[PDB]
């Protein structure tokens, strides 16, 4: 009953240009983008485990501005890096190639059939490609191959650079939600996500951004996130979601009933509410 | 195989420490009800915390590969040597843990001719000062023959206020021994030993479901056959971890939502089948 969208930085195969291309989407439940240009079916957000472990761990030294006044994607960058260099996340000497990858085209659906289309980017130089960790997502082979007004939308964006020493996360909520050319849809933006790092084991970008994005599509943490006013606040809502999350493990069973054990033992998990 | 899960506790007539059989695992698992019995088996869920905690304490585990010992004593000895060893706990801690890990072991009969049970912790028994109980396996599910071998896994759990810190011990024996911990006549060739104080994220009895169901997917018990060094049972865990799937809460829980589900259950099954 809002709006996510997940974007990632990639470079497509007509022009060689780095962009941010859609990838994902949550009102209700979750679409994928598929290879050239069509959505995959609708699907419940399932999560890997090490996306949930990596998101934790970066948003518990994640940078948070909290009731930001900006009402664009430049005056917000321009903000979460300064605030990323005051807490010591990225380097003054990485600033200006961020800036610059953050303030590149934002590309969608409609504009992938008339690219090559997308492969997935690293940062090196300033601002050049490469891409030295699974070639089709999970969510791409199986599933590819309701917004009223505000109705506010959270973008979440995932990008690899090999000069950063750790991944970063940026929290942003914006002080008065605000239409960005990032977002095609005539939805105001209230939440940013920011999320760049070099490669490491465990860290898939795009499950991280799944993971940071299915959280703001979960209503209680969405409302924890409208309220907080520390980071702490926000962390002690993701051990919150984390406490009413359910793991299956790789069970040989009847698939259907499998998923459907899950029910009652869910139903239970969710009272008073999550937390 | 056969796994069998094992809380310390402390009982309502005697009051003395001792094992109590919590749950057991034949395929699927079995709680133990409040007095005394054996709930409905059904599939392992597993708390996201539990989890996390299994691999912390795993990656820095303390393990024992054909460790020649046939008693429960023995193998208390050598573990509890091999946790000094490693500063998993210290040298202090050895005598009550030893005490502890010797204490009777009972299982499902004897239950009800106790008074009642209740989880106990070691110091120098007190009662659980951080918020946990009551299981949300007894509440759902509360209100046993193989051939030939089938070997069993031993998982005990239990608490103690002086460590510093949640250690896991994995034993796995030369030769498969019956023993005395466990009552089924069926020889013991696993033990888990998890020990530590209270923590927040760590339930104790979920992190013993964890390492039991570990033990009960058939991939990681290949593997902790095999394995000749810790490396490898990590190795393991991580193939256990990349095709476990999490259930985030939702607000629209839907039984249609959870059926789109379905290609990405069995597709992780597909990935953990091909691993070596």
Redesign the interface.
């Known amino acids: 009953k809002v709006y996510v969208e997940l974007q990632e930085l990639v470079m497509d195969e007509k022009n060689q240009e780095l962009r941010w291309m859609e990838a994902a989407r949550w009102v209700?439940?979750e679409e994928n983008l598929g290879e050239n240009g069509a959505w995959g079916?609708?699907?419940?957000?399932?999560?890997?485990?090490?996306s949930?472990?990596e998101l934790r761990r970066v948003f518990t030294k994640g940078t948070v501005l909290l009731d930001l006044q900006e009402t664009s994607l430049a005056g917000v960058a321009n903000q979460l890096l300064d605030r990323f260099i005051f807490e010591d996340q990225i380097r003054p000497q990485d600033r200006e190639e961020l800036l610059r990858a953050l303030l590149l085209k934002h590309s969608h659906a409609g504009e992938l059939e008339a690219l090559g289309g997308v492969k997935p980017a690293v940062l090196t130089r300033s601002g050049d490609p490469s891409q030295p960790p699974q070639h089709s997502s999970?969510e791409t082979?199986?599933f590819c191959e309701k917004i009223p007004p505000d109705s506010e939308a959270t973008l979440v964006l995932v990008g690899r650079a090999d000069f950063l020493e750790q991944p970063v996360l940026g929290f942003v909520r914006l002080q008065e939600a605000a239409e960005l050319e990032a977002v095609e849809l005539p939805v105001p933006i209230r939440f940013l996500f920011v999320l760049l790092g070099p490669e490491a084991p465990?860290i898939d970008y795009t499950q991280l951004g799944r993971a940071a994005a299915?959280?703001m599509s979960?209503?209680?943490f969405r409302i924890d996130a409208y309220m907080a006013q520390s980071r702490g606040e926000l962390l002690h809502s993701l051990?919150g979601?984390?406490?009413?999350?359910?793991?299956?493990?790789?069970?040989?069973?009847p698939?259907?009933?499998?998923?459907?054990?899950?029910?009652?033992?869910?139903?239970?998990?969710?009272r008073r509410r999550?937390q």
């Open positions: 209700q439940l079916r609708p699907h419940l957000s399932h999560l890997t485990f090490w949930l472990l999970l082979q199986l465990h299915t959280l979960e209503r209680v051990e979601f984390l406490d009413c999350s359910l793991v299956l493990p790789p069970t040989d069973a698939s259907e009933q499998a998923l459907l054990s899950l029910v009652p033992v869910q139903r239970e998990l969710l999550y």
